[PDB]
């Protein structure tokens, strides 16, 4: 605006980033509650294998399992990361495949 | 028009008056130009839309061995020449307006177009007309028949003299050889 205004208001500061689902950490350890299924948003349709998990942050969170096929039993321990899934509403947490109770999605050779 | 403000002399009771000194200075240069083109054996195209004078301007031009276009002006005429006129064609070397307007009081296309084509243009601006695209203007009255006639016969004569002088210098060229 004017100079006195730009003086009184200071220069603009770049606002600190809002921490996401992982609350700033790269990954999270988690424990399974109930394996289940969700339906995608409109233009595309499927059914995605989801879990409900608890995080070492003591928060419960809905997360996504990548790949075709898996074994996920209650009380299994998992690792999770912050990939958001573009199909579904509100699932912000992927499960890392290959660690703990989820082994690398199997090969059919 | 707003671009006549310099060429004007002043308002006499609401009617505007051109500066005749400037008229002569300009017209001299215009006629000189016209001539030097004629001598160099090139096309000259008179143009007017103005009805009163149509006949004059053709009757003038036909007698100069110069061409007139006094008529409706088809659109792509100079711009798209080879399609309109013929498979390949020569274009006017100089275009000369005895009025700068069309009967709807806009600038004649030929102005925009000549100017578009790198053709020089010699024309009579009037107090309402826009001079700025015309190569050599002559500020002056386009409307009164004494004026049209005058300008006609003058461009006529400049042409004729250029042509004669051409012939002569050609004969001298032929004796020198």
């Amino acid at each position: 605006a004017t100079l006195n205004q730009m003086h009184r208001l200071g220069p603009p500061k770049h606002p600190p980033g809002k921490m996401g689902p992982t609350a700033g950490r790269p990954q999270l350890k988690g424990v399974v509650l109930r394996t289940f299924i969700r339906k995608p948003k409109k233009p595309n349709s499927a059914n995605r294998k989801c879990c409900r998990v608890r995080l070492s942050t003591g928060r419960e969170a809905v997360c996504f399992i990548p790949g075709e096929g898996h074994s996920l039993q209650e009380h299994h321990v998992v690792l999770v990361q912050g990939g958001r899934t573009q199909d579904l509403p509100g699932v912000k947490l992927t499960v890392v495949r290959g660690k703990y109770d989820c082994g690398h999605v199997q090969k059919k050779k | 028009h707003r671009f006549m403000e310099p060429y004007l002399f002043g308002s006499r009771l609401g009617q505007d008056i051109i500066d005749l000194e400037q008229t002569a200075a300009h017209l001299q240069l215009a006629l000189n130009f016209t001539a030097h083109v004629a001598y160099r054996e090139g096309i000259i195209l008179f143009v007017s839309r103005h009805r009163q004078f149509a006949h004059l301007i053709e009757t003038t031009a036909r007698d100069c061995g110069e061409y007139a276009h006094t008529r409706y002006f088809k659109g792509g005429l100079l711009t798209n020449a080879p399609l309109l006129l013929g498979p390949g064609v020569r274009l006017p070397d100089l275009i000369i307006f005895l009025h700068t307007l069309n009967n709807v009081f806009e600038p004649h296309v030929a102005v925009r177009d000549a100017a578009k084509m790198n053709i020089p243009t010699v024309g009579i601006v009037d107090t309402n007309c826009n001079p700025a695209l015309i190569t050599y203007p002559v500020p002056g009255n386009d409307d009164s028949p004494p004026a049209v006639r005058l300008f006609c016969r003058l461009f006529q004569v400049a042409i004729s003299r250029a042509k004669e002088k051409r012939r002569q210098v050609e004969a001298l060229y032929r004796l020198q050889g």
Partner: protein, 135 residues
Amino acid sequence: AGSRLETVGSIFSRTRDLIRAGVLKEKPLWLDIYNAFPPLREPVFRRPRLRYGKAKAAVQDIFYHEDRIRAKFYSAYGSGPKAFDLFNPNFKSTCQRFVEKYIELQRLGETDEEKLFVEAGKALLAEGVTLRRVG
């Protein structure tokens, strides 16, 4: 080809410069003639802008003191009984005579309008012109 841009600059500019870039391989006629005798102003394109605000024109209206007299003449008699001709370059009207008489009675050193006007009227009466005398 060439350059068809009507706004960019004068035809002289474009042509000279396109030859300068050796695109146009043939010097055109009017070009050389032009170089020889250029016109007053380059034929450059200008938007015809409207005038806003306080801007007026530069034209000077046209008036003579002769006119300040003629005003009074037409104020009395009207347009001359001899009518007018715009074909005849030397035509003098009733008005013009009046102006001349008034100029000579001004060189006779009379500052009063009544005297100047009326006596000039007497000069034209002596010249046999009919002064209608309208109120």
